Design an enzyme around this catalytic site. Structure first.
Site: not given
Ligand SMILES: O=C(Nc1ccc2n[nH]c(-c3ccncc3)c2c1)[C@@H]1CCN(CC(=O)N2CCN(c3ccc(-c4ncccn4)cc3)CC2)C1
Length: 347
Positions: A24, A22, A139, A26, A29
């Site tokens: 978003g 997927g 959140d 962030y 992934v």
């Molecule tokens: O941890 C996250 N997802 C995960 C993790 C482990 C998984 N294992 N398996 C799965 C899975 C899910 C669904 N179906 C099958 C498998 C996982 C999904 C989500 C993805 C993103 N994360 C948060 C994160 O990495 N951060 C907080 C937000 N942040 C952020 C937000 C916006 C922007 C941004 N950049 C550019 C334009 C606009 N905004 C930049 C940084 C970066 C660090 C939460």
């Protein structure tokens, strides 16, 4: 490097055979094969260094997840980035691979009460640990709850997390907020910055309601409409709750509304377990000072079969570091992200 859906995904050679999961705001992934541990993992590509806000969310995510260790919270297994600050453009965070998330699951499956009960228990068990570290998730929602086929649940996404600060929770009426609209407590729109633990309990209550019916309970279409939806079900606040409201403008607004009677939980959820609805009522309490706390929710009769404080661990110490990071320019935050990820470097 391999490339998934056009974009460069430069994680070789330890991680290969990438596949899209997927995307978003962030970033993106994927799932990938780990060649050292010999297993598939999740890897997300973050590219935040052009803006302070994106750097703040990245640093919170990394700093918190590296300090937490709990079965119901996703960990960080590895972090890939360039060897120097000059060359660092993207950051790849490696985490345990799960099968799906609660948002996706609720699109296709109606959950039995015993699944809802076990998932709720795990959400609250993980939240107890988060709150014991004096951290607020801020959140919680179905897409931030990862699930596998054995029904293990892990909370993810600490991008909007903060250290709790009840003394500085107060703000004005209709103050802008970042976290997902449908899961915002009523006080966010009235007088609160979301700096108390009660903010997370409201979101859990919304998630429980959503598991009971496969529909969001308060699908506001815009900022104040969110409060419209909440008051439409809870009904008009009591005089005691209005007198707790702080702000002149919030008091005046609530006093100006016609009287609204409460919609009973058993009419909204006629097939739900009565103990689940009693706990839902306590989590979806209007006044945050009267809202159930995480340890009380774990001890509620609905979760009696799982309740075991000896198996509901807490953090070894509360977090005291800056999670506002409001006053740091993006260049300084890049330096901190660089330092925080140094332990994963070969050498
Ligand atoms: O941890 C996250 N997802 C995960 C993790 C482990 C998984 N294992 N398996 C799965 C899975 C899910 C669904 N179906 C099958 C498998 C996982 C999904 C989500 C993805 C993103 N994360 C948060 C994160 O990495 N951060 C907080 C937000 N942040 C952020 C937000 C916006 C922007 C941004 N950049 C550019 C334009 C606009 N905004 C930049 C940084 C970066 C660090 C939460």
């Amino acid at each position: 490097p391999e490339m998934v859906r056009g974009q460069v995904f430069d994680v070789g050679p330890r991680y290969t055979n990438l596949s899209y999961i997927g995307e978003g705001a962030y970033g993106m992934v994927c799932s990938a094969y780990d060649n050292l541990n010999k297993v598939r993992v999740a890897i997300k590509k973050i590219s935040p260094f052009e803006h302070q806000t994106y750097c703040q969310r990245t640093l919170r995510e990394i700093k918190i997840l590296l300090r937490f260790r709990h079965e119901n919270i996703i960990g960080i297994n590895d972090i890939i980035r360039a060897p120097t600050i000059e060359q660092m453009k993207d950051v790849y965070i490696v985490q345990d691979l799960m099968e799906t998330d609660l948002y996706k699951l609720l699109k296709t499956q109606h959950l039995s009460n015993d699944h809802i009960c076990y998932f709720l228990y795990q959400i609250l068990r993980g939240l107890k640990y988060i709150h014991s570290a004096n951290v607020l998730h801020r959140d919680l929602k179905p897409s931030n709850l990862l699930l596998n086929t054995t029904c293990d649940l892990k909370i993810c996404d600490f991008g909007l997390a903060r250290v709790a600060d009840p003394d500085h929770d107060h703000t004005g009426f209709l103050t802008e907020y970042v976290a997902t609209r449908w899961y915002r407590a009523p006080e966010i729109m009235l007088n609160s910055k979301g700096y108390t633990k009660s903010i997370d309990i409201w979101s859990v209550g919304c998630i429980l309601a959503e598991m009971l019916s496969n529909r969001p309970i308060f699908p506001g279409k815009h900022y104040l409409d969110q409060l419209n939806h909440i008051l439409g079900i809870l009904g008009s606040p009591s005089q005691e709750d209005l007198n707790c409201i702080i702000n002149l403008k919030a008091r005046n607004y609530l006093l100006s509304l016609p009287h609204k009677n409460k919609v009973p939980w058993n009419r909204l959820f006629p097939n739900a377990d009565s103990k689940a609805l009693d706990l839902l009522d306590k989590m979806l309490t209007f006044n945050p000072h009267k809202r159930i706390e995480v340890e009380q929710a774990l001890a509620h009769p609905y979760l009696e079969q799982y309740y075991d404080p000896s198996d509901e661990p807490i953090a070894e110490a509360p977090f005291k570091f800056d999670m506002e990071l409001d006053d740091l320019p993006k260049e300084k935050l890049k330096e901190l992200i660089f330092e925080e990820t140094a332990r994963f470097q070969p050498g």
